[PDB]
Amino acid sequence: GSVSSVPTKLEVVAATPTSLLISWDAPAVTVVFYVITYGETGGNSPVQEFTVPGSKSTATISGLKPGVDYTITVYAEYYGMTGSPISINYRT
């Protein structure tokens, strides 16, 4: 591809001990929807995922455990292809 399929600048913009507000910069191409995944870092806990529409570039993650390291990833879904993910770690 001639432009990146991946979002940029994934970051936690606000946090409580059990919830995170994340933001990312959309890729150059219109996205059908995004997938957000989160799970305990290294913890062999179940990873969970949800979506937000391609018109949104933020999401809230709730129900987390305080003081726990989490790995959060976002990737874009398109007609005909799935984008690669961008990932961050964050400790509640």
Partner: protein, 111 residues
């Protein structure tokens, strides 16, 4: 063109639920009613598969033309299998197309 996966599924439509037989071919996803009749199809290169957790164990397929269709499936595992198989094949599909009336007949016949 080969058949890779097929299952009964329940389509959620306006005010009703419908039993469909869904077929993943190498280049397209086909939805039929029961002799078979095609309700609709989407080339894989024009499709996006979305997990739906409300209702639970559901998914939505979006077509490049702006339509989308929602199904209940039997389990989270089968739902994940369908997404993975579709993704694997999407990596091998590059060109959008439209089937002629007879092509669809032959396609439905093969079913």
């Amino acid at each position: 063109r080969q058949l890779l996966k097929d299952s009964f599924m329940v389509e959620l439509v306006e005010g009703a639920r419908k039993l469909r037989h869904v077929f993943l071919f190498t280049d397209l996803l086909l939805c039929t009613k029961l002799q078979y009749d095609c309700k609709w199809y989407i080339p894989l290169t024009d499709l996006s598969f979305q997990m739906v957790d409300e209702p639970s164990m559901a998914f939505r397929v979006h077509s490049r033309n702006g339509k989308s269709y929602t199904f209940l499936i039997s389990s989270d595992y089968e739902r994940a299998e369908w997404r993975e198989n579709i993704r694997e094949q999407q990596k091998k599909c590059f060109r959008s197309f439209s089937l002629t009336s007879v092509e669809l007949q032959m396609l439905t016949n093969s079913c």
